[PDB]
Design a protein around this ligand. Structure first.
Ligand SMILES: [Fe+3]
Ligand SMILES: [Fe+3]
Ligand SMILES: [Fe+3]
Ligand SMILES: [Fe+3]
Ligand code: NI
Ligand code: NI
Ligand code: NI
Ligand code: NI
Ligand code: NI
Ligand code: NI
Ligand code: NI
Ligand code: NI
Ligand code: NI
Ligand code: NI
Ligand code: NI
Ligand code: NI
Lengths: 170, 170, 170, 170
């Protein structure tokens, strides 16, 4: 095996490869939302910018797992990236609710990754998960939650409130 | 003929003269909208500014065709500029819809100009049309489309949404 | 159809959607090469940096087609992104040769896109292809060709020449 | 006992004292390598600088455990520091391989320290180990691994490749 590998279980390595694929998939989903909101019949540039940045951050999150895999001596295995579940995301609120559900799904997978690492007594991997992923995931979920509440207050249906709330995101 | 003229067909020269007149006409239309929106009983300074700038840009577009005509050795022939189709433009949305229809009419004429130039094997004229007119025309049409959608979302009828959307244009 | 759509054929729109998928696939391939070259048993940081940048540029190329699709009033349809053909890329030379073949495949598709646009008399689309894709594609192919030749000169097999050439890329 | 001591097990305190000795020993080993590479018949100033810095970092690592011991109310007990296993380290590659083996031995001891702290339910000590030692240890092992691979590529035996690779370390 790798000259650097030490205390790195095959199950953790395999789970990192699946989390890489999931981060790339979330990046793709946010990319699809971003350019949905730049359609001439949607035209929500604040939502577009918010999801474009989220798309870039998830691709960075995938790359941090790829660097991690190499750092521990595991071998990266990239699978196909599934098409986003939708091609059209509805209103801003429906896209935010879809993003909320996605971030909670990613969070669930990360907590299962932490349980795998903890079960295999890998403190270096539990540290990565707590410092770089679990922390940022809980903050994202809180922020999307706040946004859903603010948009429901302003008026979530294709109206003045959605137009005003979209400026807060620009 | 002109000492500079070379590979410049009489039909292209004649079509440039008609496109000059159409650019000047569009400039006049936008000028009329601009000062319609500064009427004391309309008072939409953002729409006024948007259409004033569009008026200046179309006059520049006409001048670029006049410089082009002289550059190829054609002779500029300016006709009368017709009165704008309307003296009153309604709401912001109706003016935007009228501008959308006008920009698509100008775009149609430009594509017919490109077909004339292509039929006469004039690559220099097709380059001008692609670089200076077709590109900017498609971006304008997209921008007006976005604006129509945003104004429909904010509330297109003489109300708070039109007042708020008008500030985005200031 | 879209309020902005004009002179935009369904075949061009469909071909743009397939080119989007191909740009995303090339981005994924370069991402895989980039982190292959950061494996502790490869350790070619110059190749890693070169392919990481190429990965980012291809994702930008995909986004420019997505903006274009929206600008013309077409509708983006993103398919699944296939796994890279390889998980391990061999030497620097073999990765460069694989990138060369990939860039020529992308170039072939772009020229077929240009023929589709030209057949449908879409000068705006032929302009995009010439200005943003065909130009950059020919320069990339030339640059990779130069690099292959330089690496063959320095010594393409896992030796001092590959180590020295890798510093030129850092 | 100490006025500050709280939730600090005698076994953790004793294990910190042994890890202090091991950090000091590694510092001594790197010091020996550093001045081996400044011998007039070795003259590898890049390797010399790399090992001198590694020697300083390990002495800092020992001091951080000494500050930690005092912070928890444990009592520092310093033993004798053993002579380095070798007085002559061979080539750069052999010294790097010896450093790799040493860093993995230190890493093993640190993970056993983490198990001791975890068994005694000391979250403050597990945090220190993850944040200040396990993280840096895995990065060092990866870096030495990369260097071994790069030096094997450049030519690990007393030749041009070792001379060139040594400049990368300067
Ligand atoms: Fe993520
Ligand atoms: Fe114009
Ligand atoms: Fe590309
Ligand atoms: Fe240390
Ligand atoms: Ni996030
Ligand atoms: Ni609704
Ligand atoms: Ni509505
Ligand atoms: Ni315009
Ligand atoms: Ni009305
Ligand atoms: Ni009203
Ligand atoms: Ni390229
Ligand atoms: Ni070979
Ligand atoms: Ni070799
Ligand atoms: Ni170190
Ligand atoms: Ni030897
Ligand atoms: Ni020798």
């Amino acid at each position: 095996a790798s000259q650097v590998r030490q205390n790195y279980h095959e199950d953790c390595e395999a789970s990192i490869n699946k989390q890489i694929n999931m981060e790339l998939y979330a990046s793709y989903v946010y990319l699809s939302m971003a350019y949905y909101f730049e359609r001439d019949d949607v035209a929500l540039p604040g939502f577009a910018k918010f999801f474009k940045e989220s798309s870039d951050e998830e691709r960075e999150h995938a790359q941090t797992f790829m660097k991690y895999q190499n750092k521990r001596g595991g071998r990266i295995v990239l699978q196909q990236i599934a098409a986003p579940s939708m091609q059209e995301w509805g209103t801003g609120l429906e896209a935010l609710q879809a993003a909320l559900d996605l971030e909670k799904q990613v969070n669930q997978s990360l907590l299962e990754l932490h349980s795998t690492a903890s079960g295999n007594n890998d403190p270096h991997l539990t540290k990565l998960l707590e410092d770089e992923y679990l922390e940022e995931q809980v903050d994202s979920i809180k922020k999307i939650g706040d946004m859903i509440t603010k948009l429901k207050r302003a008026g979530p249906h294709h109206g003045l409130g959605e137009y005003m709330f979209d400026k807060e995101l620009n």
